[PDB]
Each structure stands twice: as structure tokens, then as C-alpha cells.
Amino acid sequence: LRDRERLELLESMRHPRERDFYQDHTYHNQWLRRDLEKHQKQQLAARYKYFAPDFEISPWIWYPGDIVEVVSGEGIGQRGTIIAVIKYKNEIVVQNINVQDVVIPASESRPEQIVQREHPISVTRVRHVDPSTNEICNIEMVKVRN
């Protein structure tokens, strides 16, 4: 009954005689810059931990079009091509590795449709594969004068 959908049901169930005063205004001013609850702060940090300074990877060896193999997580040993890369999150999107349904809420012109797209994968999970060796190989950034 704490949901907006059941708010009307809750109000109807509540007796008429019991009155709730501050329906439109409030005693304490609500335009003061104050903090949130500890659990809310923790949820914010967990949801966006990439806001921290120097969160990205400095060398950043991972670029689209490379070939990598997953070393940990759901799919282990499966390799593919990096479809996309999210640098500020340190995430990768590799074809046919992490496929999950992507629901789309219905609208006035179309109904709900379920679509599957590769989801981002943590950078540390995958390792580069050398095309010549076709095996897992350590990579390092190098500088060359073209």
C-alpha cells in the first residue's frame, strides 16, 4: 500500500476522522542544502562509483575492433570482437558474450517489445588475444614514430 498505485486505496481505507495536516506546505524550510540518509548515500556511491577521481585506466589498451577472451564471470573462455567501449565506466561490449533482454515499455503508437543486446562487461574481465599467436597475450602501450 506504500506505492503510488495503491495510494488511493490506502486513502480510501483510512478513516475520514483522522486528519493529515501538512498536505501542501511544511513547517521546516525544504530549500536548505542538507545531507541524505546513510543508506541513500551508499546506494548512490554503488550506483555511480565511476565519479571518483582517476577512476579510468591510464594506458587504456582496450579499443573497439580488438579480439579478447573473457577470463572471469558468466562466460569464461568465450572470445569475440569488441563491439563498443565505455571509457568513463571502464566497460566493454563484446559480440555474443553478455547478451541480456532489453525490455521497452509500450507507448501510444507501439506495444511493449523485448530486444536483446550485448551489455557492458568490466574491462578487467577480458584479456587481449594476439592474432598471430591466437592466444592470451599481455599488452603494453608503446610509442613509435610513424
Binding site: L1, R2, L9, L10, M13, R14, H15
Partner: protein, 184 residues
Amino acid sequence: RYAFVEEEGVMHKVNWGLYCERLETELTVTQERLPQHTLLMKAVPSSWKKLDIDISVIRGLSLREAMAQCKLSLRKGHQIVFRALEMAQQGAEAKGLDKEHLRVAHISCYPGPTDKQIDIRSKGYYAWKTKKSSHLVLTLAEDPEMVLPDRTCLPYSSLMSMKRAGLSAQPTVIDVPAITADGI
């Protein structure tokens, strides 16, 4: 990770993940296959102490009589129970259970969230009034052998008043031939 299970008198290692997923799947499917619909209403606007009384009143009744008593009562708990019964009846209808054979197999409440309100008092004293809420569990099962009392009977006063008005004491029952698809 392996889980030990007693098999043939000795402990045997099985895949722990498969073991857990199988256990949870079996529990869920067994509960679903049970011929009953269970509903949980959270944050009921009624103190659990008071709501327990109405729950005990409504306990162990057929759905018809439970609804009738809740509608004929004047209690917050009874109104909440009526709402819960309506929701559970809709759920049972969607699940396929037979409405005419529905019965209440479990009705209980336990304390839920609790808001607090400040109540000023003279001499500078104050306290915190407690706004209580309850969690209501309502289970509707089916009892095909259940036989319901005949409540269509009405007082002789009503009978003779209707007779004076010209109405018929008995219902005007008309035989209704069953639907058929012979013409198709």
C-alpha cells in the same frame, strides 16, 4: 563449490549451484501448483493488535460469508479484510480456481512499518505518538466438498410485504437450455 547430499548411505558431492537452483525451483513450483492463491498486503493502515481481532473473526469462513460479514461490519480491520478478499478473489479467478468453492485457509497479520507523530503537551512536555501499520496475509483455497448455508430465505414480514406488493416469493426461475454449436 560442492554440496554434500546423503545418497545410498554415504555423502555425495553435487554441484552446489545446481542444487540450490533446483531446490528453489521445486519450492516455487510446488507452491504454485498448490490449489490456493496467497496474497500479501503490506503497510495496512491499521494497528496489528486491532487488525488481529477482525482477522480472528473472519478466520475459518467461506469466501461468500467472509465478504458478507466484512461488508456488514463497521470496522477498519473488516474493511481492510474486504479489500484483501477482493484482491485474492481476483487473483484466484486469474489463476483458474473455482469462485463458488473458495474458502479462507489462512488469515494472519504481523507488525509492519511504524510512523511517529509529535503530540505537544502542557508544562513543556512532549512525546511521540505511534502510527502503526500491519502486514496482512490472506490465503484462499478451494474446498469442493464445502456446502454453504441457504441464505436466500427471508423473514415472513418481507414475504408478506412482497405478496402485498404483488411480487412472487419464489424466484421466477426459467429453464435455460445449454449453449450448443450444432448450427456451426
